[PDB]
Amino acid sequence: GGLTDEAALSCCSDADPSTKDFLLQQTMLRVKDPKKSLDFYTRVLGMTLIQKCDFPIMKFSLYFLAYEDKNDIPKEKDEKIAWALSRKATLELTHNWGTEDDETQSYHNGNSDPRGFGHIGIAVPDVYSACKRFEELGVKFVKKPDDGKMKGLAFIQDPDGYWIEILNPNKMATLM
Amino acid sequence: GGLTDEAALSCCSDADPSTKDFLLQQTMLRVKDPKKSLDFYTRVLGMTLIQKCDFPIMKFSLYFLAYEDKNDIPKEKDEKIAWALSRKATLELTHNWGTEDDETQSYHNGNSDPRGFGHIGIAVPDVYSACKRFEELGVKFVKKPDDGKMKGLAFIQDPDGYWIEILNPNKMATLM
Ligand SMILES: N[C@@H](CCC(=O)N[C@@H](CS[C@@H](O)N(O)c1ccc(I)cc1)C(=O)NCC(=O)O)C(=O)O
Ligand SMILES: N[C@@H](CCC(=O)N[C@@H](CS[C@@H](O)N(O)c1ccc(I)cc1)C(=O)NCC(=O)O)C(=O)O
Numbered sequence: 636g637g638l639t640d641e642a643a644l645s646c647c648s649d650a651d652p653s654t655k656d657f658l659l660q661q662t663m664l665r666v667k668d669p670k671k672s673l674d675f676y677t678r679v680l681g682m683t684l685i686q687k688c689d690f691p692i693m694k695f696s697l698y699f700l701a702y703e704d705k706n707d708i709p710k711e712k713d714e715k716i717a718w719a720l721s722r723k724a725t726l727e728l729t730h731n732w733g734t735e736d737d738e739t740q741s742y743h744n745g746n747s748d749p750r751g752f753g754h755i756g757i758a759v760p761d762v763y764s765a766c767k768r769f770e771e772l773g774v775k776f777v778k779k780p781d782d783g784k785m786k787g788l789a790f791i792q793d794p795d796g797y798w799i800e801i802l803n804p805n806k807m808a809t810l811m
Numbered sequence: 812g813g814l815t816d817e818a819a820l821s822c823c824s825d826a827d828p829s830t831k832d833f834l835l836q837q838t839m840l841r842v843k844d845p846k847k848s849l850d851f852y853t854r855v856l857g858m859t860l861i862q863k864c865d866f867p868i869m870k871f872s873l874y875f876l877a878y879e880d881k882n883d884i885p886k887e888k889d890e891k892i893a894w895a896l897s898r899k900a901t902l903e904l905t906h907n908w909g910t911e912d913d914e915t916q917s918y919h920n921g922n923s924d925p926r927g928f929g930h931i932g933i934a935v936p937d938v939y940s941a942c943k944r945f946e947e948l949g950v951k952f953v954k955k956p957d958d959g960k961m962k963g964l965a966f967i968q969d970p971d972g973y974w975i976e977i978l979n980p981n982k983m984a985t986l987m
């Protein structure tokens with residue numbers, strides 16, 4: 636079986652005071668073609684590009700996306716970086732230059748061997764209307780809301796095949 | 812080369828009004844042994860276990876961790892699930908029952924072929940003092956702050972080998 640509630644709680648320690656201002660800032664995914672990824676995360680999911688970083692010597696670019704208002708992005712370069720990297724829950728897309736033209740390359744989504752990472756998840760007001768719009772836009776589904784084992788939640792895929800869960804927090808209580 | 816700023820902006824669309832309340836709620840990682848993972852995320856990183864879910868029929872448990880105050884967790888079951896799954900920036904650890912006793916099993920961190928997912932990142936007030944405490948606790952480092960190419964940021968590993976970046980948002984402006 637799994638851990639009992641009691642055993643799980645027994646493995647948890649209270650937070651040391653030196654970790655009090657820590658925050659979960661980002662999740663990083665590698666993307667083959669940033670033009671496709673930027674269109675997907677902004678047009679389909681409504682995220683905002685808050686910061687683009689280029690490192691010519693190492694041949695890669697980074698794209699930070701988040702659910703933030705465009706009007707809150709600072710104009711000054713140094714303030715912009717400090718603000719972008721101190722937002723909670725950002726998505727960092729890494730583009731290693733050249734992958735978009737290489738037919739033998741692709742990234743692995745973690746859901747087939749060898750497994751590891753599973754998904755990112757977006758909380759929405761209504762899974763059914765959000766998925767109706769996704770179907771209208773031609774988005775590829777891993778799991779429609781009424782398919783699979785757990786009903787009421789969905790999995791879509793981004794341009795690289797990463798899985799994105801679509802969930803409504805106020806309808807999850809009957810799954811357990 | 813990579814995308815110019817102008818070309819990147821050209822691939823972004825304004826957010827459709829039906830995505831206005833969407834939020835980036837979780838990142839899911841599979842963990843071999845939840846006892847080790849819970850101790851690492853709570854004792855080393857100071858996160859709080861906000862919700863534990865067990866699915867006996869499918870043989871797995873889910874552990875949601877976040878930088879949230881323990882006193883804000885609702886007491887009622889249904890309110891607790893709605894609150895936990897509407898927090899931004901949570902970490903979902905999936906335990907498939909039995910992996911902790913299987914010597915031939917382990918998860919892949921995404922940083923060696925086949926690559927995909929890279930890391931989660933934690934923003935802290937001071938990278939050097941946080942890493943000093945991590946060293947005192949026996950945490951395994953992928954990259955100490957002054958090693959590697961980008962100075963001032965670190966990468967530590969959790970019990971499964973997943974990479975966790977330690978960064979100070981106010982010291983990143985000179986890297987570009
Ligand atoms: N054996 C699986 C175990 C994990 C698992 O099965 N996760 C669920 C989504 S719950 C999840 O990811 N999530 O965020 C969540 C957490 C708590 C609740 I309550 C509801 C949803 C899944 O993929 N279901 C497919 C289906 O139902 O057909 C694995 O390794 O991925
Ligand atoms: N070829 C690489 C490209 C991505 C990459 O190299 N990322 C950096 C951390 S920046 C990153 O992950 N992050 O959040 C970040 C973003 C913007 C800034 I400004 C600073 C840090 C890395 O791993 N450096 C190792 C080293 O320096 O030795 C890859 O595929 O992983």
Ligand SMILES: [Zn+2]
Nearest residue numbers: 663727932976
């Ligand atoms: Zn990063």
Ligand SMILES: [Zn+2]
Nearest residue numbers: 756800839903
């Ligand atoms: Zn999930």
